Ligand binder design. Structure first.
Ligand SMILES: [Zn+2]
Length: 226
């Protein structure tokens, strides 16, 4: 099982994100582990530049779908593991309704025994007292299904999905996600049948940590084979 063998145990994870939203620069550094057997991802993400100038929930989708649990019946549809260890590029555009947009490029690959995600994020067209730069989003997260389809012509996959962020005063901030993933290698990859990834996301704090940070626990399971 090419790539899948790399994910049979607990894999250490490093995340490094360099961000600029409306000219406000920030870096995020993350450490944790992934246990694909259980679809389990645990990360502690730290803003190393001081105060994060956007809400932590707006970066959850950006901050390792190779840790999704594909049931045994669906192992032929797992593109993300098939691209390893050479890895893949994930690009997203995220449009916040009635606000700005994020454009992200991430390179997901192994460095020795460690799965690394090097991410660059650029945000433009935000309102200074909107929900994002105004910090008006709740520190919580809704379950959602991500529909995956083959992009046969780009030897990869695509996905589009809607995230609803809870606004403090009540109401929801829509974030429309458009995603493409392409392998880094010329190694063969699995191009899947349509399916979805079911996400459950839990956000918390390390009570001992004084820097601006997010503890992220997520469980991701492939489904949607009719
Ligand atoms: Zn088929």
């Amino acid at each position: 099982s090419k790539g899948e063998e790399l994910f049979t145990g607990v894999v250490p994870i490093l995340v490094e994100l360099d961000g600029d939203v409306n000219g406000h620069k920030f870096s995020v550094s993350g450490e944790g582990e992934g246990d694909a057997t259980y679809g389990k991802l645990t990360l502690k993400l730290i803003c190393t530049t001081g105060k994060l100038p956007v809400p932590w929930p707006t970066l959850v989708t950006t901050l390792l779908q190779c840790f999704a649990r594909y049931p045994d019946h669906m192992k032929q549809h797992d593109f993300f593991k098939s691209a390893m260890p050479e890895g893949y590029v994930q690009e997203r555009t995220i449009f916040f309704k009635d606000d700005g947009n994020y454009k992200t490029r991430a390179e997901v690959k192994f460095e020795g025994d460690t799965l690394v995600n090097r991410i660059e994020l650029k945000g433009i067209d935000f309102k200074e007292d909107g929900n994002i730069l105004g910090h008006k989003l709740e520190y919580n997260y809704n379950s959602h299904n991500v529909y995956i389809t083959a992009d046969k012509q780009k030897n990869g996959i695509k996905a589009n999905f809607k995230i609803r962020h809870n606004i403090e005063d009540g109401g929801v901030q829509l974030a429309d996600h458009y995603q493409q993933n392409t392998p880094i290698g010329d190694g063969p990859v699995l191009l899947p049948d349509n399916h979805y990834l079911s996400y459950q996301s839990a956000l918390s704090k390390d009570p001992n940590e004084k820097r601006d940070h997010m503890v992220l626990l997520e469980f991701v399971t492939a489904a949607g084979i009719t």
